[PDB]
Amino acid sequence: FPLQSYGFQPTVGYQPYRVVVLSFELLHAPATVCGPKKSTNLVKNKC
Amino acid sequence: QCVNLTTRTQLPPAYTNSFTRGVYYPDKVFRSSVLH
């Protein structure tokens, strides 16, 4: 049988933990998600 | 609800030339007048 289960019970080193992997691909496309930053009016012909 | 078409005629695969087609933009970056 290929699987083995966790033994959950109302019972420190073996307690369950919730794990999330939050990946990124920040270069391969136009950006679709951004942080809370405010835009400003673009200016031209000045450094 | 699938149909078995045993009427298919099986033959050795044909072949042809490929010329130079099969090239695709490796990345979503704009490049101009450059050898990459």
Curated annotation (Swiss-Prot), chain A:
Span within the parent record: 490 to 538 of 1273
Phenotypic consequence of H28P: Increased resistance to human covalescent sera neutralization
Gene behind the chain: S
Protein name, per record: Spike protein S1
Quaternary structure (record): Binds to host ACE2. RBD also interacts with the N-linked glycan on 'Asn-90' of ACE2. Cleavage of S generates a polybasic C-terminal sequence on S1 that binds to host Neuropilin-1 (NRP1) and Neuropilin-2 (NRP2) receptors. Interacts with host integrin alpha-5/beta-1 (ITGA5:ITGB1) and with ACE2 in complex with integrin alpha-5/beta-1 (ITGA5:ITGB1). May interact via cytoplasmic c-terminus with M protein. May interact (via N-terminus) with host bilirubin and biliverdin, thereby preventing antibody binding to the SARS-CoV-2 spike NTD via an allosteric mechanism.
Region (Disordered): 28-47
Functional note: Attaches the virion to the cell membrane by interacting with host receptor, initiating the infection. The major receptor is host ACE2. When S2/S2' has been cleaved, binding to the receptor triggers direct fusion at the cell membrane. When S2/S2' has not been cleaved, binding to the receptor results in internalization of the virus by endocytosis using host TFRC and GRM2 and leading to fusion of the virion membrane with the host endosomal membrane. Alternatively, may use NRP1/NRP2 and integrin as entry receptors.
Result of changing F1L: Increased resistance to neutralizing antibodies and human covalescent sera neutralization
